[PDB]
């Protein structure tokens, strides 16, 4: 996360770290959506251009974390994966269209002060909140700048951007399964996701019921926190039918 700040303790209790077994290293962010299901970006698990194709046994998830590198004894919980599910129309070839994946845990994780699931949006909450200018929140342990790494989880609040501005900022083909967020050059304020933040949540606090909803997944950008560029996020609601189908069938 570029130009963010240290998270408060328990600020993002749905935050998940995807961790590689060997070598031991951070792979991605992710989010807890129930006691047995974790949501992330497909490109965190499958991206052939970079020779990435992880299987269940390559990975762990670490839940309830704050420190990036420390083993947080008595606080974090580490879970093995039962099964990975990648969207069947995930477009790794072109533009990361439908950049979403689910991971089912081998055992349910116990909720605590530091571990708690985020809500997924219904159609109306999505319609009401996914509007240009409305701010969401992105969290992660990714790089602090484009070209270093944080001691603890970072947070940044960023406004959703008008679709034409998103489109006009890039040569990559954008789709309805994506939205973009970030400040414009004139707005003064800054901030963005960066490498390592992939797969983490873009969340919004509904002013109707005071609950946090995950509207996006950190998906792609061109550089980090560049003027005139914006971060792109998987549109979680647009893909919720798939999420529900997987959970209903394999839960």
């Amino acid at each position: 996360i570029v130009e963010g700040s240290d998270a408060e303790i328990g600020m993002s209790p749905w935050q998940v770290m995807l961790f590689r077994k060997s070598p031991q290293e951070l792979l991605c962010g992710a989010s807890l959506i129930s006691d047995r299901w974790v949501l992330t970006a497909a490109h965190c698990l499958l991206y052939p251009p970079w020779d990435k194709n992880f299987t269940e046994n390559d990975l762990l998830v670490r839940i309830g974390k704050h420190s990036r590198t420390r083993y947080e004894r008595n606080i974090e919980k580490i879970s093995m994966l039962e099964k990975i599910y990648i969207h069947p129309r995930y477009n790794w070839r072109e533009n990361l269209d439908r950049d979403i994946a689910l991971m089912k845990l081998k055992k349910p994780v116990a909720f605590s002060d530091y571990i708690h699931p985020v809500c997924l949006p219904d159609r109306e909450t999505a319609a009401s909140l996914l509007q240009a200018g409305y701010k969401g929140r992105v969290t992660g342990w990714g790089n602090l700048k484009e070209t270093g790494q944080p001691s603890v989880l970072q947070v940044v609040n960023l406004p959703i951007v008008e679709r034409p501005v998103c489109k006009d900022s890039t040569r990559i083909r954008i789709t309805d399964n994506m939205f973009c967020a970030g400040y414009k050059p004139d707005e003064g304020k800054r901030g963005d996701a960066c490498e390592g933040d992939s797969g983490g949540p873009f969340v919004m606090k509904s002013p109707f019921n005071n609950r946090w909803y995950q509207m996006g997944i950190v998906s792609w950008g061109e550089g980090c926190d560049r003027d005139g560029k914006y971060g792109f996020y998987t549109h979680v609601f647009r893909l919720k039918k798939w999420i529900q189908k997987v959970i209903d069938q394999f839960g």
């Binding site: 985020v118 701010k135 609040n157």
Partner: peptide
């Protein structure tokens, strides 16, 4: 589940985090 999106150390205790008000203010 029914308790999703309510943080034990914030919503559940009626405590606000330092920047959530920034989000609320943008929801016009």
């Amino acid at each position: 589940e029914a308790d999703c999106g309510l943080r034990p150390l914030f919503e559940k205790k009626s405590l606000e985090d330092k920047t959530e008000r920034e989000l609320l203010e943008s929801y016009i």
